[PDB]
């Protein structure tokens, strides 16, 4: 139906050297190709993504031009009852190492929707789909993969 | 009338090493006094702030206690139609150094509601309050921020 994609998605498919390169290529492909639907993100993840590819000196363009005046990504403009949720649960986690507001907000969102998560963090509430991705699909769709990859030019 | 306030005012206010400390905690004071009027943040800067002090190992809990739950701050959330203007700030921007979707969102709202922007960032298009706060005051100011500082124990 319809999918939330965290932060650390983005991050690994620009990242040619992160652990969860071709965990994030797969899950690009697979999400464009329609696999989860609908594609979303918050104004938190969106904001967290384009300052942290920017930082690592990543293509924060190419993500621009890529997946949001694509319109491949809808952006989900969080509000004032969503975000007091999302502080409760904040609050409530906030001695719990590497949880983010951005984290607090796509909990509150994703349950409310009913996304499926899209994450590598293993710290979520909710089921998440990624880790172990790439590791996991047959080796004739790792090919396939593979080949658009260094043919099509993704990334 | 109204004041914007940026992330790296908070940090130096709990980061009693920064080389902003006193001008932070001097801010705080003046800003808490009314100095600059009503009190703003947006979501952004709310969670680039409570996701840092977290990160840094600083009072997250007592920044939302204090700023947050006391309602010494109100909290702007960004619409779709300010997103879309800081996401063109953002674009133009994509190349220079230190520019966030936070400070793109930041320079948006603080021009369209026609606040004060405080901040430590040299960057922003708008003039800031910030720089040099401290060693600006007149002497006797200090002594009295000084002893709140100590005496009353914030921080």
Not at 36 to 39: A, N, P, S, T, V
Not at 91 to 96: C, I, M
Not at 115 to 123: F, M, N, P, Q, V
């Given at each position: 139906m319809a999918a939330l994609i965290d932060t650390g998605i983005f991050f690994?498919?620009?990242?040619?050297?992160?652990?969860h390169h071709m965990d994030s290529v797969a899950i690009v492909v697979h999400a464009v190709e329609g696999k989860?639907?609908?594609?979303f993100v918050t104004n938190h993840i969106l904001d967290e993504t384009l300052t942290l590819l920017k930082?690592?000196?990543l293509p924060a363009d190419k993500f621009l031009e890529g997946f949001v005046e694509s319109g491949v990504l809808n952006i989900i403009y969080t509000d004032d009852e969503v975000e007091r949720k999302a502080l409760e649960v904040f609050?409530?986690?906030?001695?719990?190492k590497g949880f983010s507001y951005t984290d607090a907000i796509s909990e509150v969102v994703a349950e409310e929707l009913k996304?499926?998560?899209?994450?590598?963090?293993?710290?979520f509430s909710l089921p998440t789909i990624g880790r172990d991705y790439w590791?996991?699909?047959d080796e004739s769709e790792r090919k396939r993969i593979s080949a658009i990859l260094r043919e099509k030019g993704i990334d």
């Open positions: 690994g498919f620009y990242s040619l050297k992160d652990v989860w639907g609908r594609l930082y690592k000196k609050k409530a986690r906030v001695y719990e996304l499926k998560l899209i994450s590598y963090d293993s710290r590791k996991s699909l």
